[PDB]
Ligand binder design. Structure first.
Ligand SMILES: Cc1ccc(-c2csc3ncnc(SCCC(=O)O)c23)cc1
Ligand SMILES: [Cl-]
Length: 331
């Protein structure tokens, strides 16, 4: 198993050697903590202030534990800095005596997806998914897998029509043929590759997670695939994509389910995507939307659209045409 795109990025390049990175710490006294805004598995997140500049920022304090993960996240953020719709890392700092490091980010005045997504229109979804594809195409082109794509990690300032892809703490450089930990991403957004222990996965894992978000958006069904645990997650996928396509995916990739998991999966016909249409989401669903979704949510990661191919899909024609018209008028 090898990717259809970008296999040669970390093989024709200190670029991906994050373990040997030496961090250029800034002055911790430059940023002050004002309010806790959330928690992560290894971190706490605060709103802060740049005392010199007086501008708002986000302060992520990472438990001094897990130093190689800290440097992986810093390395990846620095390599992506300036890329389209990637959260900006402003600084890296730490106490001096306590050692504990803090990642300083731009502040996005976001609306939490749980309240925002039910208010999204057809146009909004095409717009914001296109903005997110810009970030994934970019990071994939730099040879980086995000591996935690989900609405929680997509900050949308809806008033500014502004989107940022955040939390690169699980991101990793792609090396063709390398085997990767399959304990990444969040349950509802895990791709089949992870749920059946296919370890030589690639950027297309992010495109499965995107397809999960997109299906949740257009069908107003979050999460779309609602497993009660990691085994039930594959069951819930199988109840949609069908077991025929699964057992052919498994066949193609030399994989065999734990007899106990195989039993849980059972046998299921592929359901048509039209089954998820109802009166309350019909305005978000079009033939193009369904076709795009169908091209993302496929067992075979090799058969999914790449981020670049996705941006070329008909569903985004009006978004591309709007950018083209604006650029023409502004010139
Ligand atoms: C658990 C949590 C809490 C707060 C926020 C957040 C709200 S607005 C906002 N604007 C920019 N960044 C963040 S998080 C720092 C970036 C990262 O972890 O990659 C946030 C994001 C996640
Ligand atoms: Cl602090």
């Amino acid at each position: 198993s090898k990717a259809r795109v970008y296999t040669e990025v970390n093989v024709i390049r200190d670029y991906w050697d994050y373990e040997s990175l030496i961090v250029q710490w800034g002055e911790q006294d430059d940023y002050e903590v004002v309010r806790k805004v959330g928690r992560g598995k290894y971190s706490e997140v605060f709103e802060g202030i740049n005392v010199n500049s007086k501008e708002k920022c986000i302060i992520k304090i990472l438990k001094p534990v897990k130093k190689k993960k800290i440097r992986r996240e810093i390395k990846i953020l620095q390599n992506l800095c300036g890329g389209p719709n990637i959260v900006k890392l402003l600084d890296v700092v730490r106490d001096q005596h306590s050692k504990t490091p803090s990642l300083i980010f731009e502040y996005v005045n976001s609306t939490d997806f749980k309240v925002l997504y039910p208010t999204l229109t057809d146009y909004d979804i095409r717009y914001y998914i296109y903005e997110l594809l810009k970030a994934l195409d970019f990071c994939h082109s730099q040879g980086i897998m995000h591996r935690d794509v989900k609405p929680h990690n997509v900050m949308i300032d809806h008033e500014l029509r502004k989107l940022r892809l955040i939390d690169w703490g699980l991101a990793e450089f792609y090396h063709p043929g390398k085997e990767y930990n399959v304990r990444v991403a969040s349950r509802y957004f895990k791709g089949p590759e992870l749920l059946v222990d296919l370890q030589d996965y690639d950027y297309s894992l992010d495109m499965w997670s995107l397809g999960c978000m997109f299906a949740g958006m257009i069908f107003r069904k979050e999460p779309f695939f609602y497993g009660h645990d990691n085994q039930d997650q594959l069951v819930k996928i199988a109840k949609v994509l069908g077991t025929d396509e699964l057992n052919a995916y498994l066949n193609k990739y030399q994989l065999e389910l734990d007899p106990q998991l195989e039993a849980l999966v059972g046998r299921h016909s592929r359901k048509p995507w039209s089954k998820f249409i109802n009166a309350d989401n019909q305005h978000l669903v079009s033939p193009e939307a369904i076709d795009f979704l169908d091209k993302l949510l496929r067992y075979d990661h090799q058969d999914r659209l790449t981020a670049k191919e996705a941006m070329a899909h008909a569903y985004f024609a009006q978004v591309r045409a709007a950018e083209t018209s604006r650029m023409r008028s502004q010139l």
